[PDB]
Amino acid sequence: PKPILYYDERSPPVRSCLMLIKLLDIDVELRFVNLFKGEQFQKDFLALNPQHSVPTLVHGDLVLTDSHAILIHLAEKFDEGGSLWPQEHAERMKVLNLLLFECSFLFRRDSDFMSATVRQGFANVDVAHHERKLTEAYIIMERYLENSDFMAGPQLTLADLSIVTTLSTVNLMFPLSQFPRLRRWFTAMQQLDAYEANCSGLEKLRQTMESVGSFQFPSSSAVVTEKVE
Amino acid sequence: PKPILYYDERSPPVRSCLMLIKLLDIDVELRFVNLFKGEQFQKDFLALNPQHSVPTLVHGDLVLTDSHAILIHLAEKFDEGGSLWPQEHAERMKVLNLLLFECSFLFRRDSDFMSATVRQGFANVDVAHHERKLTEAYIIMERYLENSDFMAGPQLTLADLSIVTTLSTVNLMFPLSQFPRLRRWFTAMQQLDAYEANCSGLEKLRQTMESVGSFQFPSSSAVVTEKVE
Ligand SMILES: N[C@@H](CCC(=O)N[C@@H](CS)C(=O)NCC(=O)O)C(=O)O
Ligand SMILES: N[C@@H](CCC(=O)N[C@@H](CS)C(=O)NCC(=O)O)C(=O)O
Numbered sequence: 001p002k003p004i005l006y007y008d009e010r011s012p013p014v015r016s017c018l019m020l021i022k023l024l025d026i027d028v029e030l031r032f033v034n035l036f037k038g039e040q041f042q043k044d045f046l047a048l049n050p051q052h053s054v055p056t057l058v059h060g061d062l063v064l065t066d067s068h069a070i071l072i073h074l075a076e077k078f079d080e081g082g083s084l085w086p087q088e089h090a091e092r093m094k095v096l097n098l099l100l101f102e103c104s105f106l107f108r109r110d111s112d113f114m115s116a117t118v119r120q121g122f123a124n125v126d127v128a129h130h131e132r133k134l135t136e137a138y139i140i141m142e143r144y145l146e147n148s149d150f151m152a153g154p155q156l157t158l159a160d161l162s163i164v165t166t167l168s169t170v171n172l173m174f175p176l177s178q179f180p181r182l183r184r185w186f187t188a189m190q191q192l193d194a195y196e197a198n199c200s201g202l203e204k205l206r207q208t209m210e211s212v213g214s215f216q217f218p219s220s221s222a223v224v225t226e227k228v229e
Numbered sequence: 230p231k232p233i234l235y236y237d238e239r240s241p242p243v244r245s246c247l248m249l250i251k252l253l254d255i256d257v258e259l260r261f262v263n264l265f266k267g268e269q270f271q272k273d274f275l276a277l278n279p280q281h282s283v284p285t286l287v288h289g290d291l292v293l294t295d296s297h298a299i300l301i302h303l304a305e306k307f308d309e310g311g312s313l314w315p316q317e318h319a320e321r322m323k324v325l326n327l328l329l330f331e332c333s334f335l336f337r338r339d340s341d342f343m344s345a346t347v348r349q350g351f352a353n354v355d356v357a358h359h360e361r362k363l364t365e366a367y368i369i370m371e372r373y374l375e376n377s378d379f380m381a382g383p384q385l386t387l388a389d390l391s392i393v394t395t396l397s398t399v400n401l402m403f404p405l406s407q408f409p410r411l412r413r414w415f416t417a418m419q420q421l422d423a424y425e426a427n428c429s430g431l432e433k434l435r436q437t438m439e440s441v442g443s444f445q446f447p448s449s450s451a452v453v454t455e456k457v458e
Binding site for chain 1: 279280290291293298301302305306318319323325326330333337368
């Protein structure tokens with residue numbers, strides 16, 4: 001049976017999966033779990049995914065509860081022999097290493113800042129603390145791009161899809177004026193037709209955060225190319 | 230050339246890699262990076278791994294900066310066709326999904342609690358908050374063990390090696406009296422000869438945390454079997 005994706009498009013890891021689904025033209029079923037209404041605690045969803053997180057994928061008897069596993073699974077089943085999840089071991093391990101940087105470092109710090117803002121209100125967040133932590137992630141990604149125009153090498157991989165959604169989300173708040181390779185990479189990712197799958201949920205997240213957090217993101221921070229405007 | 234592991238054995242993800250290296254009898258080189266003295270910021274290590282984290286593995290030109298990538302890489306190179314990282318796609322995706330639970334959920338919450346304790350002192354930590362967050366991880370792992378005696382099924386996998394080190398670390402602080410399947414699994418993991426590679430660094434972490442945090446872990450919390458005593 002075809003895969004079922006449980007999602008809230010405001011979530012960056014969800015958007016990474018939506019981008020892969022569009023890029024590979026995968027036929028999936030969709031289920032909307034509204035995180036800002038606590039629907040991830042609904043008894044059937046919680047029994048499915050005890051971590052109460054999106055994205056979640058059901059594919060026959062296989063239940064995946066992490067975007068990075070979903071990206072790998074979908075690439076292996078719907079892009080066998082492709083370049084997004086390369087067959088060469090060293091190349092594949094570099095993509096895996098970068099998926100784990102997204103999970104462990106970039107998303108962790110984005111999520112800490114955004115979660116604090118929803119729970120406490122923007123006025124009660126240590127914004128300078130979060131600016132340092134997220135700028136530190138920008139420094140790292142600028143270094144990852146020193147010798148290549150994509151995160152894992154000269155070609156688009158799953159790592160770019162995982163990172164770009166969270167990067168777009170961080171960049172609602174923190175500008176890309178001092179990270180030229182990162183800004184150029186983001187600009188290039190915005191020209192991909194698959195990037196259209198990031199746009200609705202990024203904008204919904206922007207509006208939801210400004211409402212629930214009682215603030216406005218700095219209008220100058222977000223990088224918005226002509227194609228996406 | 231043989232792999233080089235950069236490590237501090239106090240780190241649970243480091244200990245997962247030490248356990249795999251012992252289990253598979255892998256010949257690696259070792260480099261000690263003392264995290265409690267800031268040696269992860271030494272210029273050569275920071276150039277190698279901009280995330281300033283252990284474990285880091287150098288294997289020829291391949292540089293891995295995440296325990297979960299290291300576990301997968303080492304299983305693929307030193308246990309090809311084995312059961313720790315199974316070849317069957319659905320089984321492999323279940324192990325991957327659990328490695329990502331360790332990264333995203335269990336380690337995130339352990340690290341938040343332990344990092345707060347080092348930075349602020351135990352007296353300045355919201356222990357009840359961290360107890361709730363880590364008990365929630367215990368609830369999830371008890372559910373993962375409802376139908377199997379290892380985390381991903383009836384056999385030891387990389388998921389057990391990744392999870393047991395962080396679980397042992399959480400359980401210095403929070404008891405396993407209300408999580409019987411999880412306690413039984415931990416007791417079983419302690420009987421594996423590879424578990425000996427967890428013991429020195431768990432004890433060093435216990436002593437370092439009590440010194441730097443100015444507290445004592447509850448002596449009753451840790452589960453310590455006869456083999457490990
Ligand atoms: N490592 C996970 C992170 C998933 C995650 O934390 N998603 C958030 C939204 S960005 C979520 O579902 N939050 C709801 C909750 O934790 O209750 C992945 O990559 O899928
Ligand atoms: N997701 C990473 C986590 C690595 C990590 O954060 N390790 C800690 C020790 S438990 C570290 O090196 N901390 C030093 C620092 O962040 O400066 C992995 O699995 O390797």
